[PDB]
Point group: C2
C-alpha cells in the first residue's frame, strides 16, 4: 500500500471525501448548472452515439477536472514514484468500470423499442418488415462494438496496472532484502504473495464498486419504470413499487446470505490453519528422520479431515439459501409485474426492460456473492504480508 | 489415478466402451423395447412430477443395471480399497450431472406455456386472471425445489468424493514417505498438490460432460422446435435449420476461440517457468548471503516482466474474439427467428423456448471456455506430480 499509494491512511480517506463532495455537487446542482452553460438537452439517444453526445462529454470533462484537482493536490503534497499509476491509473479504472455500467444501461434501454417491435410483429403477421429487425440489431451491435473495444482495452490496462502494483511491492521488498532474508517463507511472500495480493485486491475492488455503480445507474431507471407498475401482487399499491421491491430483494437478499454464511469465513480460516500445521510438520520431516512420523501425520490429517468435513456441512446451509435465492430470482422480476401484465398497463418492451434491470443488478451482485471465497483468500494473504513486514520493522 | 481408481489404462477405456454400448443400445432399440414391456406412454409432464414418472423411472433402473454390471465386473476383476468411491461415486456424480441437465430441459419446456400465457394477457387486457400466473409460477417452483435439493446434495457429495481422492493420494504418498522424503518440495506435493489435483480434475471432468450432456439433451429439443422455423435469414430454407445453425454456432464458435488462443497455453507455461526460476533463486538466496545478487534478481524479474507483457498482448486478441462472440451470441438466437417472427409462424413461448435453448447451451459452454485457464493449472499440477513419483 505505502509502496504504491501516497500515504494510504490519508489518501483513501481524502479520495472518499473528495468523491463524495464531487458526487453530491454533481447530483444536486452541478449536473444541471453546467449543462445550462453548455446548452445540453436531456434527449439521450438509445443508439451508440450517446457516448459522445453533449451530456456525456460534459461528464467526461467534469470527471477529468475532479480527478485532475485531486491528482495535482497529491502530486505536490507528497510525490510518489508510482503516483501516475496509483492515482491516475485507478481513476481510469474507476471511470472504465462506470463506462461499462453505462453501456449496460444503454443496452437495457434498447430492450424496450426492440421487444415492442417483436410484440407488434407477433400480434399481426406481415406487419413489421425484416428490415426493421435488421436495423434494430444494428443499433445493438453499435453499442456492442463500443463494449467490445473498451472491455478489451480495460483488461489490458488492468493487467498492466496490477503488474505495476507487483513491481512496486517487489521493489520495496527487494530493497531491504537483507533484513527480510531470514524470514521463513520470504521467497513465497516476495514472489507469490505480491502478485496474488495485487490481483485479488484489485479484482474485488472493481467488483465492489461495479455492484454499487449498477445500483446507482439503475435506480433512476427504475424510478421512471415504476410509473407503469402502480400495483404489486401482495403488498398492494405503493408510491414507489419497483424501486422499493428491487432494493429490498437485492440488498436484503445479499445481506441475508452474508448472515447465513457468517460462520463460513471462520471455518475457512481454521481450514487454512490445520493445512498449514500439516504442511509445517512435513517440512520439518523432510530432513529429520524423527519427524513426520506415521502416528504424528495421522492425527494432523485427521484434524484436516475433521475441519474440512465441518466446512462441507455448514456450507450445505449456505448452498440451500444461495441456490433457493437464485431460483426465485429467476421469476421474481416477472412476479412483480403480474398485476400490470394482467391489467394490460405495460408492453413487452417494458416487461423485458424491467426484467433486464433486475437481471443486470442480479449479475452484478452474483459476482460479489461468488467472490466471498476470494475475500477470505485476500485476508489470508494480507495477514501473511503484514506479518512479513512486521518482522522487517 | 492408480491409487484411487482401478487400473487407469483399462478402467477408463472399459468405462468409455461400456458407456458407448449402453448409449447405443438404449438410443436405438433399448429405450423403446424396455418401455413396451413396462407400458409407459411417451407423454412427459411439464411439471416437476416428470422426474418420478414411468419413463424416468425406467431410465433410473437401466442406469443402475448398467453401472451395476460394470461395477460387479471390476469388483471381481481387480478389487480396490476405494472402489465404492471411484467406481460407484463417479457413476453417482455422472448421473446427478445428467439429472441437473434434465432439470434444465424441464425448465426450458416450461417457458413455452408460460410465455404463451403472457402473450395472451398482453394481447387482451383482463383476459387472463392472476390466478393462472400464480399456478404457472408454482409449477416452476416445484421444479426449482428439486433443482435446489439435488444441487445442494450434489455439492455435498462432490466435495466428499474429492476429499476421498485426496485421502487416497495422501495415503499412497505417506506410505512411501521415506523414499519421497528427499524430493525437493515434497511437502507441497503431498499436501497442496493432492487436493488441487483432485479438485481441479473433478471440476473440469464434470464441466466437460455437462457441456456434452447439455448439447445431447437439447438436440432432440431443437429437432422438434425446428419444425416451426422453416426459413432462416440469410441461407433461406434448409432442413433442420435450427439444429444446424445451433451446432455450427456453438461447436465451431467454441472451436474457433480455441484456435485463436492456441498460443495462450504455451505462454502461460512459460510464465510459470520464469516465476519458478525467480522463486528458485530467492529460495537459494534465503540462506546464502552472496547469491542474493541484486543484479541477478534484476534480470530474473525482467524475464518475468517480458513474458507477462507478452501474455497480456496475446490475450488481447483472445479478448477481442471472446467478447465479440459473447455480444453476438446475445442476439444470434433472435436473429435466426426473424423470418419466423415477421411471418407470424411462432408464438412468444416458442420464441422464448428456442432462445432459452441457445442460452442454456451457451451457459454450459461458457463454463468450459472460462475454464481454459483451469486446464493449464491441471497440466502444471500433473507434471509436478508425475515427476514426483518418477524418482
Ligand atoms: C482511490 C484511488 C484514487 C481515486 C482518484 C479519483 C478521486 C476523485 C474521483 C471523483 C469523481 C467524481 C465524478 C462525479 C461522479 C458522479 O457525478 O456520479 C456519477 C456516477 O459515478 C460514480 O459513481 C463514480 C464515483 C467515483 C467513485 C470513487 C470511489 C473511491 C473509493 C475510495 C475508497 C476509500 C476507502 C477508505 C478506507 C479508509 C453519475 O453520473 P450521471 O448519472 O450524472 O452521468 C450520466 C450522464 O448521462 C452523463 O452526464
Ligand atoms: C469412469 C468412472 C466409472 C463410470 C461408471 C459408469 C460406467 C457405465 C455407465 C453407463 C451408463 C449408460 C446409461 C444410458 C445412457 C443413455 O441412454 O443416454 C442418456 C444420456 O445419458 C448420458 O449421456 C450418460 C452417459 C454416461 C457417460 C459416461 C462417461 C464416461 C467417461 C469415460 C472417459 C474415458 C476416457 C478414456 C481415456 C483413455 C439419454 O437419456 P434419454 O434422453 O433416453 O432419457 C431421458 C428420458 O426422458 C428418460 O428415459
Amino acid at each position: 500500500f505505502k509502496s504504491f499509494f501516497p500515504k494510504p491512511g490519508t489518501f483513501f480517506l481524502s479520495a472518499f471525501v473528495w468523491a463524495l463532495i464531487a458526487v453530491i455537487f454533481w447530483q444536486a446542482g452541478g449536473g444541471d448548472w453546467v449543462a445550462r452553460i453548455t446548452g445540453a438537452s436531456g434527449q439521450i439517444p438509445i443508439s451508440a452515439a450517446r457516448f459522445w453526445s453533449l451530456d456525456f462529454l460534459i461528464f467526461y470533462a467534469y470527471y477529468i477536472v475532479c480527478v485532475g484537482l485531486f491528482a495535482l493536490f497529491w502530486f505536490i503534497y507528497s510525490p510518489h514514484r508510482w503516483q501516475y499509476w496509483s492515482i491516475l491509473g485507478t481513476a481510469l479504472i474507476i471511470f472504465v468500470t462506470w463506462f461499462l455500467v453505462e453501456v449496460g444501461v444503454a443496452v437495457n434501454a434498447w430492450y424496450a423499442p426492440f421487444y415492442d417491435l417483436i410484440q407488434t410483429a407477433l400480434s399481426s403477421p406481415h406487419k413489421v418488415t425484416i428490415e426493421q429487425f435488421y436495423r434494430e440489431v444494428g443499433v445493438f451491435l453499435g453499442i456492442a462494438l463500443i463494449a467490445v473495444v473498451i472491455s478489451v482495452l480495460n483488461n489490458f490496462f488492468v493487467s498492466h496496472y496490477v503488474f505495476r502494483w507487483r513491481t512496486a511491492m517487489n521493489e520495496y521488498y527487494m530493497a531491504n532484502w537483507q533484513q527480510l532474508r531470514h524470514i521463513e517463507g520470504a521467497a513465497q511472500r516476495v514472489q507469490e504473495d505480491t502478485m496474488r495480493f495485487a490481483s485479488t485486491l484489485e479484482n474485488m475492488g472493481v467488483s465492489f464498486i461495479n455492484a454499487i455503480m449498477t445500483l446507482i445507474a439503475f435506480l433512476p431507471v427504475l424510478v421512471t419504470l415504476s410509473a407503469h407498475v402502480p400495483e404489486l401482487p401482495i403488498i398492494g399499491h405503493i408510491p414507489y413499487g419497483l424501486v422499493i421491491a428491487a432494493i429490498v430483494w437485492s440488498l436484503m437478499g445479499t445481506g441475508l446470505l452474508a448472515v447465513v454464511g457468517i460462520k463460513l469465513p471462520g471455518l475457512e480460516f481454521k481450514n487454512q490453519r490445520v493445512e498449514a500445521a500439516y504442511r509445517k510438520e512435513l517440512v520439518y520431516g523432510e530432513d529429520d528422520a524423527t519427524r513426520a512420523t506415521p502416528p504424528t501425520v495421522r492425527e494432523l490429517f485427521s484434524a484436516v479431515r475433521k475441519n474440512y468435513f465441518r466446512l462441507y456441512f455448514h456450507y450445505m446451509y449456505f448452498n440451500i439459501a444461495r441456490i433457493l435465492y437464485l431460483q426465485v430470482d429467476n421469476v421474481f422480476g416477472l412476479f412483480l409485474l403480474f398485476p400490470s401484465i394482467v391489467a394490460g398497463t405495460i408492453t413487452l418492451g417494458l416487461m423485458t426492460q424491467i426484467t433486464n434491470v433486475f437481471g443486470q443488478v442480479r449479475g452484478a451482485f452474483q459476482y460479489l456473492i461468488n467472490s466471498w471465497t476470494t475475500l477470505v483468500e485476500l485476508m489470508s494473504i494480507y495477514k501473511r504480508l503484514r506479518s512479513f513486514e512486521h518482522e522487517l520493522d
